Every structure is written in C-alpha cells, then in structure tokens.
C-alpha cells in the first residue's frame, strides 16, 4: 500500500487481487483523504461546470498568446474601454 | 506496507494470570511503537528496514519472544 | 418488448413494430404475424 | 364514485408489506411524525437544558427525579450518576454525594 | 407482526442491540423503543433513533433523539417551571446565554413536567420541544443545530380500489385540509412499474393561509408522494388529502 | 456478504446437522444441496420454487362449462427477480391440465405475461429457479373473454 | 363487474379439496414458498456452515 | 460486473442481498481507474478560491459571444488596443 | 454511531477500521454518490495540461490579468479600437 | 418583526408557540412610539364630559 | 424608569434593550395608568370619531 | 423536467414537446416519437 496522499500515486492494480483484505480500510481512507485534499475548497453547492460541457477541454490553451476574446456588451457602468460614442463626442467637442 | 498496521496477539501460556500486564518494547521506537496488553497493533512508518518486535511481560518470567518484521 | 428505429422501412422492422404496438406478443403470436401481414396486404391490393 | 382520503393518522407506518396493497392512509416510511387518530404533524424537536452552568460539561449515564428529602424542602431534585461519581442538583448548585 | 418487524430487527441488529431501551411517554400516550442508529461505532451506546408506538390507536412511527444514554421525567428549571416578573432581577434583554424562552409553552401535564435526556454531547437535552435538532459531527468535533426534518413517504399508489393498476393516471392536484400555520415542502413522482421506488418529478411548497392546493403533473401509473417540513416556525398539521386524477391508457 | 438480512436482534442463525457429513443453514440465499447416490457426491443447484393451482372455473364470475379465452396475467410484483410462468388447461374439471406455453416475467422490463388459451378450466404455475432473484408476488389480474359451450 | 385477485398470501396450500371450489388466492400445491398475509416469495435456501 | 458498461457514471446501488465482499477490490480498482481517467493530469487543485466556480456556472455558454466578468478596470493603455492611442496620432501628425 | 452518512465532504478517520463490516459497500456507494453529485457531467476534463494551474494561478485576482504584450489581433466587434472611417467621413463633411 | 409593516393598526395575535420573551421590550417600545405618534401634542384630555362624543358620532359628515 | 403618570413622559428607547427584565411590569402598569388617566371618561361604547375622518385634523382651527 | 423553448422551430424541440404533453418518460414510448411524427407528417402532406 502506497504512503502518498495525492492523485496518480498508486496503481489501481496494486491490490493484485491477492493482497490481504485488512488493507481495504486503508485504501478507502487514502482515497477519501486524497479527494478531500485535492479539492479542499468544495463546500458551496456542487457548482457543476464540466469545462463548458462542449469544447473547452482542448481549445482552452494559453502558452504564448491568449484566445477566446470576450464578447462583453457595453460597459456604461464601471467606465473601462473607450466606448466609440463617448470618444467621438469628446473629440468633436474638444 | 506503507501505513498498514497489522494487529498481533500474545496468548500467555497459562489460560489466566492475575495482576498481569504487558509493556511492549522495541529497540529504536522511532520506527514504531506498541504497548498496552496482549493486543499489539504494530504500526509501520517506513517502507523498508527490518525490526525486532519483542515482548516484555511485566510479571511472570522475563523470558519473552522475538518477531522479525519484513516491510519488503 | 422488441425495439425498432424511427422509420419502418422493411418487413423485418414492420413485423417487430406490429408486436410492439400490440403488447400481445409471444411465441404463438409472432409466428403468425407474417400471416396477418399477408391478409392485410391482400385486403389492400384487392381494391387499391 | 368517490375517492376520499381521510384519517391520515388512523394508521401510521406499514413497512414489510406490499406498498401497492395498503390503504391510502398509510405510509411506507416516516420519521419525526406524530398521529392522533385523524391528523399528522411534525414531532417536537430537541433542545439543551441546564439547571446550573456546571452540568453542561457532564456525560450522565442515568438519573431519577427524587421528589422529597429530609434535608431538602418541599422541592424535587435529581440523583444523576456518571462514569465514576454520583451527583445531585436542585436548580441551585451541584454536589457530589458519592459514597466515601 | 408484519409491519415493522423486518425494519426494527435490521436497524437494531447492525451496531449494538444491547443498547436498546424503552420509555413510557405517558404525557402523550406513546411508548418508544430507543436504539442506536444504523451508522455509528460498534462501541457506542448513545441511542440515536426511536420507534414510537401509540397504544391508544395502534400506530407506529419513528424519530431521532440527541444521543441519549438515558432518559427520564423531571420538573424543569425555575426559569421553565413557571417564572415570575420579580425574579429576573439579574437578567436583561441581552439574552445572557438564554434565548430559547417563551411566554406560555405548550404543556402535557398539570404539574408541567418535562422529559429530559442524558446526552452523549456532555449535557442534558429535552426530547419533545420546539423544532430544533442537534446533529453531531465527527469531522470538526462540534455540535450542530438545525431545523427538525420530517419526512412522510408512501409508494405504490395503484388506485386499485378505484380503477385498474396498470392503467396510466394523469396526476394534477392534491387538495389537502391542513390545520395551523406552517410551510410544507411537497414532493411527488412515480414509475412505470410497481417494484421500483419511483423517481421524483417535481416539488412545491404549500404555505398555509395563501395556497389551497399543490399543482403537480404526472402520468405514471404508480404514484408516490412525500411530505417534508424543515421550517422552524411551523406547527401545521395534515388531516387528509384529495387527489385529482384522470385515466389514460395502457401498453 | 456485506450485510445479510437478519431475523433477530442478536443475529442468530438456524443450523442443521446434516447427513452429508457437516452442518448446514436452513434459511439462506437461493441454493439447494441435493445428494446423488450414483456418484456419491454432493450437488448444489438453485432453489426451485413451484406454485400450482388447478381448476380455475371462474364460477364466481361466469359459468364453469363456458369456454374462456385467456390472454394475459397482470401481476403486481415487488423486488427484483426473474420468474418462469407456466399455464395450461383442460376441457374437463377432473384432469390436471396439460401445459400450453411458458414465459419469463423479468421485473423492471415486462409488465405482464402473454398466454393464449381457450380451455374452460385453466391452471397456472409459477417457477423461480434463479439464484440472484428476491422478487415477490402480491396478486394477479387475469384478462379473459367468454366463448361458448358444446 | 369486477374480477380482482388480491392477497395471494392470505391463504396458502389447500389440497384434499375440490380445486374447482376454492378461492383464487389458494394453491393446490406449493414448495419452498413463504407467505405473509399479502405476498408470496421464494423461501430462503440452504448452505453449509463450519 | 454484468457487462462492459464501464463509464464515468457509476452505479452505487447494489442488489444488497448478496455482494460477495471479495469483489470489493474490483470496485476499488474501478473507482481508482475512473478517477485517474477523469483527471489524467492533476497533482493538487488549489488557488480556485471557490469564487470563479460560481461565476463560471452562472456565466456559462462560452460559444463565441459570451458574457464574462474579469479585470474590469479603467482600462487606459491595455497594450495592443485603442483608448487614446490612435487619436493622438491624428492630433500630432495631422 | 452509524458514520455512513456523508455528502460533499467526507472524513478519512471516521471509518475507525476496527469496526463492523457493514462499513464497506455502504461507504463505496456514498463516495460514488458524492462524486456524481459534485460533477454529474464528465467525459474528459483534461483542462490542466500538466499542472497549468501553477503558472496560470491568476484566476483569483481578476484585476491584473497577464494581458500579454501581444496585440491580440483577433477582434470582431468591440467598443474599443475604432476605424479611420470617422476621419475620412469627418474630413469630407467638413 | 416580519417587515416594516409598522402602522397605527397593530397585530395583537401572536403564533403563541414561540415568542422569545426577550423581544417584549421591542413590543413595548413600539407601542410607546405608536401612542406618541397618534397623539403628538397631548397632556391630559379632560372636560369632554363624554357627551360631545355621542353628538359628534351621530352628527358626523362635517363637509360643508 | 420614569416616575411620571402622563403621556410624552418617557423615551420609548429608555429600556435601551439592556435594562433588566424585572422592569417590564412597571412599564406595563405605567402605560395602563397613563391610558386610564388620560381618558377617564371613556366608559360608553367606543364612540369612534377620528376627527371627522377626512380633513378636520388641520382645518379645525380657532385662534382669533 | 424536459424543457422546450417558446419558439418551437426544430425537430428536437418538437420531439421534447411531444414527450412533455405526454408526461410519460419511458424508453418504450420516447423511442417511437419519431414514428408518430412520421405518421403525422405523412397524414398531413398526403392531402394538404
């Protein structure tokens, strides 16, 4: 039985189907502590995300340049980017 | 193996012994520690390195036994 | 009991959709579905 | 025809029996419920209780409400026991009356 | 005999049967048999669940208790044995460790005696009081209080006494006749078979004083309905129901 | 098994002193140990249940001598399992009718059993030879018509 | 009219009697069966023990 | 089990009457394999703060034109953008 | 004492191995139910790419996003970068 | 209480099962505030003789 | 606790939500005696007048 | 809770709405919704 506390630490075939049964409790405890320490912040509702459910499992890449530019609407609140109308009015007024 | 702790039992020669008590001893307890009564409950810390689990009967003859753990 | 695809295109799937649409399906019944279909097609082509 | 469902409390939980062969006024499982012959409502919950602030750190194993005692006045008290000692409380103070 | 036998034997034969106890709840004509919950240590003796039986109408019901090592009847403290205005000379409105106080609490005895419990949580506990349940957690080793959760459950409603079982039946409404104030949480479902505990289909809250029914849409032939009351400020009741339903077909 | 069904708080089991050189439990999971004298060996096989009722004349509904076309049995079972229904009949009332068909009513998939008979005196049998079945039968509902006589 | 067949376990085997004069919830022969007042199911089998 | 229905959508419920406890190792190894398949490359998921999960669950539908919240600020320079980076050109050069 | 009731958060030391055998398939069913509820949509969540969370640990601080100096020359429509048509149109109108 | 329904038309009836007696001061202060609002300027109403009240109740409709 | 017997005599906030509870009886008694002495003649039916119910709360003026 | 959209404009939403107005959610019935829609469209266009 492994002495690790994280994922990808023990071969699922390590029981061999021949090991003694008294190790089952230690395996269940190991699995539970791993699941707990790998996601210690999961306390709110299940909050299913599934990585966008469609394609983001492969397209979500960030190595040397970002992609998937946001398609937000106008930001009349919290003035950020230079909305076209505002800058045009400012320029024509001076 | 790593973490697994197997329980050992020590059946005294006579069926009963009054005022009996066991104080398990093992050289260099930093590898493992056991005490209490006939029930040992040996704990394992490392994945290798043999050990010599020997009994120490409080009462009765000091004569005890010896066991050789094998983590590998 | 039996399954079937959306389009009933062939005899093989029609003889199963028949037993499906009628829960009265069993050995002594499915074996004569061909005879029922024969009678139906005869009654159809007799005047169609 | 008529299909009334009355006397929901006439009979309570009936398990170990074919649920498709019971009466409409029965249940296959219930918890924290109370029935009186015509009705069903939530059972009274639980809550702590402390005669004095010293009992809130005690694990009692048994007790009896002694109503009288020569030394005590016309007021009841308790004779509670623990793993090692026997205590008495009368809403004013705690005392260990364990046999010495 | 053939109502809860296989349930009690199963629930008590798992952890610790010798811890089973009983108590005569004469205050309300009930005799429950305390026993240890299903999931607990084999070395524990704190009874968790209880199967209460009414000897006046021969009905069985269950409930939960706050880890009772013992049980008994006794008069309450002076603050609950009937207090007096000129007694709170040291108490103030700042609830100095006392909040669960009420003007006139419902009584079950002329002498106003209360059933107390010797809990495993290092203290006493009342067994039959306002909606509140103290569930213990071994993770953080702390006591937790939450509303008392009631659950009613009946499966396999085939309407055999009205129409045929196998016939599909469109369920539309339940028209209950409740009493008091509260806020229930109705649940309903069904299954195309008779052996399976049907899957839920919807859920609605029947607040009393506003709503006169609950609207659910099902057409499974075998209906099942559940009733839940998790509110803290609810003392409602359910005398009976009246389901509105139609009949479809079969096969 | 993890948690076997119990019939007692202390979890006591009924044991048997068998002639097969050993002890045996009497009420346990589906398994029957039948002895054979030919090879002098113990043999284990599934437990075979059999229900049997003959002479169903429907006298409480229609006339006995009248022929009755049997089409379906609509049971209301509980649990999981796989039964093996058998049915038959006879033109008389004294004879144990001969079988006519047999169907398996697996629970969770099928809602009935389809059989075709028209003998006036029906008889149905129920068999459960499966090892992984713990089903039950609360009641039936036979669909039938009425033909004639003579 | 109505023709229900309920309480299959209310009464079990009734032999030595005219099978054409019994109730629908009866049987002329049974084996390895168990009834409790509304139901029928296979009786628990056997198994060794040591 | 019954057949190769193996998929990362398991079936907890068992017949519960006979389970052959010696098969527990099979279930444990199956759970381990499924957990390793769902998350092949993972060591210790942290830093999520359990806050972006909610915004992702509410701001779903990352397909071309999505609604997202993020570094919404004054957004003056943002290298590679406008906001008084091309107007000054016309102002000076003219 | 029955400790086989847990949802969304488990406890490794509650099993207390020196306990009856009912603890077992029950805990397995609990683990399966928790895993299904937490994420009841799982095909291949490989959105890590060899522990990218370490270098991509910017999810909690959406104020100072990396914003690579790259111009990000992928834009369809935004209230930011404007075209010079206003310059030509304005010059023509006045 | 439940919400800012506060108005000089009170709700005596209570659930009566749980009242949290420590909230009694809230009800007392509310009653005091309502009584001070309904009659802001008042010291000691007397001399009415409880006779003009009846004539005013019967001779109502002081509109033109 | 005030020692007055009339209206507009004690701040509704005087309990402070911190005073001892044994004063509640003295507050209820004070309120009741005030209500009794401010309208000692109210013994006939309620005799609702409400000041004409419409406008007389402001138009009923007599100065010169 | 099969949920359909307000502007019913496709085949999938139509199938889900058919399965909704017939609340029964069972494979024996859902798998034949295509056959029912086929019969319907063949009944309409045959004389429309």
What DSSP letter does each residue of chain L carry, written as one string?
-----SS--SHHHHHHHHHHHS----HHHHTTHHHHHHHHHHHHTTT-
d(C-alpha A55, C-alpha F13), whole Å? 58
Whether the CB-CB separation of K17 and K26 falls below 8 Å is answered with no
Nearest to E151 by CA among E85, E91, E82, E226: E226
Q: Which of E13, E166, E196 sits opposite F111 (nearest CB)?
A: E166
d(C-alpha D90, C-alpha D74), whole Å? 11
Give the bridge partners for E245, in sequence order. E171
d(C-alpha J40, C-alpha C35), whole Å? 100
* Residue I19 distance to chain E (closest CA, Å): 6
d(C-alpha F55, C-alpha C39), whole Å? 37
Whether the CB-CB separation of F144 and F90 falls below 8 Å is answered with no
Q: How many residues does chain E have?
A: 251
Whether the CB-CB separation of H47 and I48 falls below 8 Å is answered with no
Give contacts of H70 with chain A, Cβ < 8 Å: 70
Give the bridge partners for F89, in sequence order. F98, F122
d(C-alpha B24, C-alpha B32), whole Å? 11
Whether the CB-CB separation of K6 and K34 falls below 8 Å is answered with yes
d(C-alpha E193, C-alpha F111), whole Å? 7
For chain A, the residues whose C-beta falls within 8 A of a C-beta of chain B are 1-3, 22-23, 26, 30
K29: which DSSP letter?
H
Phi, psi of E228 (to 5 degrees): -130, 140
* Residue F103 distance to chain D (closest CA, Å): 24
Q: How far is CA I77 from CA A71, E40, G33, I61, I68, in A?
A: 8, 62, 77, 26, 20
Q: Which long-range contacts (CB under 8 A, 24 or more apart) does J30-39 make?
A: J30/J6, J30/K12, J31/K31, J32/K10, J32/K12, J32/K31, J33/K12, J34/J6, J34/J8, J34/J10, J35/K7, J35/K31, J36/K7, J36/K8, J36/K12, J37/J8, J38/J8, J39/K7
Whether the CB-CB separation of E15 and I3 falls below 8 Å is answered with no
L interface mutation test: which of E172, E216, E220, E249 has the most L CBs within 10 A?
E220
Label each residue of E27-87 as H, E or C: CCCEEEEEECCCECCCCCCCEEEEEEEECCCCEEEEEEEEEEEEEEEECCCCCCCCCCHHH
Give the 3-state secondary structure of residue K58.
Answer: helix
Structure tokens at K6: 């009339």
Q: What angle do CA A52, A53, A54 make, to 5 degrees?
A: 95
Q: How many residues does chain J have?
A: 64
- Token look-up 């048999």 returns E33
Give the bridge partners for E31, in sequence order. E24, E53
Give the bridge partners for F135, in sequence order. none
d(C-alpha A27, C-alpha A15), whole Å? 9
For chain D, the residues whose C-beta falls within 8 A of a C-beta of chain G are 16-18, 21
Give the 3-state secondary structure of residue K32.
Answer: helix
Whether the CB-CB separation of E144 and E182 falls below 8 Å is answered with no
d(C-alpha E121, C-alpha E118), whole Å? 9
Give the 3-state secondary structure of residue D1.
Answer: coil
d(C-alpha F71, C-alpha C28), whole Å? 12
d(C-alpha A27, C-alpha A16), whole Å? 13
Nearest to A66 by CA among C36, I58, F94: I58
- Token look-up 């038309």 returns J9
Q: How far is CA E240 from CA D38, E129, E215, E247, F108, in A?
A: 8, 25, 16, 22, 32
Whether the CB-CB separation of F121 and F90 falls below 8 Å is answered with yes
Give the bridge partners for E154, in sequence order. E225
Q: Which helix (H) or strand (E) holds J30?
A: helix J24-38
L31 interfacial to chain C (CB closer than 8 Å)? yes
Find how far residue C18's CA is from the centre of its chain: 4
Q: Which of D8, D48, D51 sits opposite E239 (nearest CB)?
A: D8
A50: which DSSP letter?
G
Give contacts of F139 with chain D, Cβ < 8 Å: 21
The secondary structure of chain A in percent helix, strand, coil, rounded to multiples of 5, reads 35, 0, 65
Q: Which residues contact I75 (CB under 8 A, 6 or more apart)?
A: A69, I81
Structure tokens at H92: 């000076």
Whether the CB-CB separation of H32 and A34 falls below 8 Å is answered with no
C12 interfacial to chain L (CB closer than 8 Å)? no
d(C-alpha F103, C-alpha G41), whole Å? 18
Q: Which ranges in H8-71 belong to alpha helices (H)? A: 24-38, 52-58
d(C-alpha E229, C-alpha E232), whole Å? 9
Q: Are strands F98-106 and F82-90 parallel, antiparallel or unpaired?
A: antiparallel
Burial class (CB in 10 A: 0-12, 13-18, 19+), A42: buried
Resolution in A: 3.8
- Please report how many Cα atoms fall inside a 13 Å half-sphere around the Cα of residue F126, on the Cβ side: 28
* C in contact with J (at least 3 C-beta pairs within 8 A): no
d(C-alpha E198, C-alpha E213), whole Å? 22
Nearest to D61 by CA among D86, D98, D96: D86
Phi-psi region for residue E58, left (φ > 0), alpha (ψ -120 to 50) or beta?
left
Cα distance between the two ends of chain D: 77
Nearest to D24 by CA among D41, D7, D39, D36: D7
Whether the CB-CB separation of A74 and A83 falls below 8 Å is answered with yes
Please answer yes or no on whether E2 and G36 come within 8 Å at the CB atom. Answer: yes
User: Crossing angle, helix C11-21 and helix C33-45, to 10 degrees?
Assistant: 110
Structure tokens at E233: 């400020």
Structure tokens at K12: 């509704």
Say which experimental method was used. Answer: cryo-EM
A52 interfacial to chain H (CB closer than 8 Å)? yes
| Closest J-chain CA to E105 | J17
- Token look-up 């085949």 returns L11
Give the 3-state secondary structure of residue F52.
Answer: strand
d(C-alpha F122, C-alpha F98), whole Å? 10
Q: Which residues contact F1 (CB under 8 A, 6 or more apart)?
A: F29, H17, H18, H19, H20, H21
Phi-psi region for residue A11, left (φ > 0), alpha (ψ -120 to 50) or beta?
beta
d(C-alpha B1, C-alpha K41), whole Å? 95
Structure tokens at H84: 């008084």
DSSP class per residue in E179-232 = -SS-EEEEEEEEESSSSS-PEEEEEEEEETTT-S-EEEEE--SEEEEEEEE--S
Give contacts of E2 with chain G, Cβ < 8 Å: 36-37
Please answer yes or no on whether E42 and I4 come within 8 Å at the CB atom. Answer: no
- Token look-up 């030509």 returns I88
Whether the CB-CB separation of F69 and F117 falls below 8 Å is answered with yes
| Closest H-chain CA to I83 | H86
Please answer yes or no on whether J29 and K12 come within 8 Å at the CB atom. Answer: yes
Q: How many residues does chain H have?
A: 94
Give the 3-state secondary structure of residue F141.
Answer: coil
K52: which DSSP letter?
G
d(C-alpha F25, C-alpha F11), whole Å? 14
User: Crossing angle, helix I25-38 and helix H24-38, to 10 degrees?
Assistant: 20
Nearest to G23 by CA among G33, G35, G32, G14: G14
Burial F92-117 (b: 16+ CB within 10 A, else e): ebeeebeebbbbebebbebbbbbbbb
Nearest to I28 by CA among H16, E141, G24: H16
G44 interfacial to chain E (CB closer than 8 Å)? no
Torsion of CA F54, F58, F59, F64, to 10 degrees: -80
Burial G14-41 (b: 16+ CB within 10 A, else e): beeeebeebebbbbbebebbbbbebbbb
Q: How far is CA K54 from CA B44, C24, J56, L19, in A?
A: 91, 81, 14, 61
Nearest to H82 by CA among I79, D29, E242, E204: I79
d(C-alpha K30, C-alpha F143), whole Å? 83
User: Crossing angle, helix K24-38 and helix J24-38, to 10 degrees?
Assistant: 20
L38 interfacial to chain C (CB closer than 8 Å)? yes
């Amino acid at each position: 039985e492994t002495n690790a506390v994280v994922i990808t630490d023990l071969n699922p075939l390590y029981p061999r189907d021949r090991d003694y049964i008294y190790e089952g409790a230690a395996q269940i405890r190991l699995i539970k502590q791993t699941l707990q320490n790998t996601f210690p912040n999961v306390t709110e509702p299940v909050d299913i995300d599934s990585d966008t459910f469609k394609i983001m499992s492969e397209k979500l890449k960030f190595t040397g340049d970002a992609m998937d530019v946001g398609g937000l609407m106008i930001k009349n609140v919290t003035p950020g980017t230079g909305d076209k109308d505002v800058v045009t009015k400012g320029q024509m007024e001076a | 193996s790593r973490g697994s702790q197997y329980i050992l039992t020590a059946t005294l020669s006579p069926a009963n012994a009054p005022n009996q008590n066991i104080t398990w001893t093992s050289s260099n307890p930093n590898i493992a520690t056991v005490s209490g009564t006939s029930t040992q409950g040996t704990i394992n810390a490392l994945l290798a390195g043999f050990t010599e689990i020997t009994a120490t009967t409080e009462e009765g003859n000091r004569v005890a036994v010896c066991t050789v753990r094998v983590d590998l | 009991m039996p399954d079937v695809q959306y389009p009933i295109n062939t005899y093989g799937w029609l003889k199963k959709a028949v037993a499906l649409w009628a829960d009265r399906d069993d050995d002594e019944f499915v074996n004569q579905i061909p005879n029922f279909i024969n009678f139906a097609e005869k009654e159809i082509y007799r005047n169609l | 025809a008529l299909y009334p469902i009355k006397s929901l409390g006439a009979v309570g939980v009936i398990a170990d029996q074919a649920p498709t062969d019971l009466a409409p006024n029965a249940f296959t499982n219930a918890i924290n419920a109370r029935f009186v012959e015509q009705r069903v409502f939530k059972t009274g919950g639980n809550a702590p209780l402390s005669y004095v602030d010293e009992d809130k750190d005690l694990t009692p194993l048994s007790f009896v409400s002694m109503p009288f005692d020569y030394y005590s006045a016309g007021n009841s008290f308790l004779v509670v026991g623990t793993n090692k000692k026997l205590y008495k409380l009368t809403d004013e103070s705690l005392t260990d009356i364990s046999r010495k | 005999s053939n109502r809860v036998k296989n349930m009690l034997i199963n629930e008590v034969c798992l952890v610790n049967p010798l811890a089973t106890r009983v108590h005569l709840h004469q205050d309300k004509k009930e005799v429950w048999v305390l026993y240890v919950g299903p999931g607990e240590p084999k070395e524990s003796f704190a009874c968790t669940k209880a199967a209460v039986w009414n000897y006046e109408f021969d009905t069985w019901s269950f409930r939960t208790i706050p880890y009772a090592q013992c049980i008994g009847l006794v008069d309450p403290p002076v603050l609950e044995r009937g207090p007096i205005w000129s007694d709170f000379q040291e108490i103030t409105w700042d609830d100095p460790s006392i909040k669960e106080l009420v003007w006139r609490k419902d009584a079950t005895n002329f002498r106003q005696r209360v059933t107390i419990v010797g809990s495993f949580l290092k203290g006493f506990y009342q067994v039959d009081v306002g909606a509140l349940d103290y569930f213990y957690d071994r993770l953080n080793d702390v006591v937790i209080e939450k509303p008392l959760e009631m659950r009613l459950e009946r499966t396999g409603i085939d309407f055999d006494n009205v129409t045929n079982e196998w016939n599909q039946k469109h369920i539309n409404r339940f028209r209950p006749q409740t009493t008091g104030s509260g806020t229930y949480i109705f649940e309903a479902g069904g299954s195309q078979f008779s052996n399976e505990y049907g899957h839920p289909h919807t859920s609605k809250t029947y607040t009393i004083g506003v709503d006169r029914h609950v609207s659910v849409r099902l057409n499974h032939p075998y209906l099942f309905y559940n009733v839940i009351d998790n509110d803290v400020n609810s003392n409602a009741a359910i005398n009976g129901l009246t389901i509105e339903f139609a009949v479809g077909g079969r096969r």
